[PDB]
Amino acid sequence: GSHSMRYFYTAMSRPGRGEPRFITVGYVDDTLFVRFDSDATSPRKEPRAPWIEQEGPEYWDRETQISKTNTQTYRENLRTALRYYNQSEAGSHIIQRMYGCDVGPDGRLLRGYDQDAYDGKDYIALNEDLSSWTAADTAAQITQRKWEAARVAEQLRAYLEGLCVESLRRYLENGKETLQRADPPKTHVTHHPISDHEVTLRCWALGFYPAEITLTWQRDGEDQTQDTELVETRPAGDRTFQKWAAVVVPSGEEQRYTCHVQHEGLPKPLTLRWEP
C-alpha cells in the first residue's frame, strides 16, 4: 500500500514554570515509533515500536542530538514569534510543526510536508513543489524572507527526497509484519429502541488498522449523511481503532437501512443490515 512518515513537534511556553517544553513524536502511518520529551528525566529519543529497536547506538545518539538542538531552536522560535506579534511575555504560547513524506507502493516519494503553526493558526508551510513557502501573515513573511535567503527549502527538499524516503523504506521492511499488515474491521449492527416508534441502528467497526475507514448508512440505497451520527475514529490501545455510525429509524423500517463499510483491509466494501 501507500505509506507516510511524520514527525510532530510541540513547543509550549509556560512563563513562571521553566523553559518551554519540547516534545517530538514520530509516526509511520498510524504507528508511533519514537518520542522525545524535554521534560524527561534524561531527555533522549526513545523507541516506541519493536522494529525501531534494531537501529544501532549511533542512530539513537544522532536522533537524540537533533531533538536536543531542536529544543533550543524552538525556544528561540517562541521568543521570536512573541516579538513578531507584539505579544507580552506573560502568556503561554505553542508552536507546532509537522513534516515528512508520503510514498507509494513502489517506495517512491508521493509528496513531502513541512508546516508550522503558531497558537494553532497556520504560520509557514513548504509548498508541494518543495521549493517555495506560504506565509500566513506579515509575521510569517519575515521568516519566509529569512528562509529564502538561507535556502532552507533546498535543504528540506534534499531531506524529503532522500533520507525521509530512504529511512521510511527501511522502517517498512523492518516492521513489515505490522506496518504492512492491514487489519480489517470486525463489524456488527446493534438495535436500540429509543421509544415506541423510533429505534437506533448502530453500525460498529472494531479492531481495524490503519485508522482510515468509511462507515455510511443508506436508506433505500440513498446516503443518509445528514441523519447519521458518526463518532470520531478512536484508538483501542492495542494499535487498532474503532468507529461507529448511528441512524434513528422508524419502527418496522429497519430493513430499508444498510450499513456500508470501506477499509483497506477489505477486498470489497461490506454491506450490513440489522439481523433480528
Binding site: I66, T73, A81, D114
Partner: peptide
C-alpha cells in the same frame, strides 16, 4: 529519521 533544520524564525 529526522534531519536538523537549524534555521530559526
Amino acid at each position: 529519521e529526522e534531519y536538523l533544520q537549524a534555521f530559526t524564525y
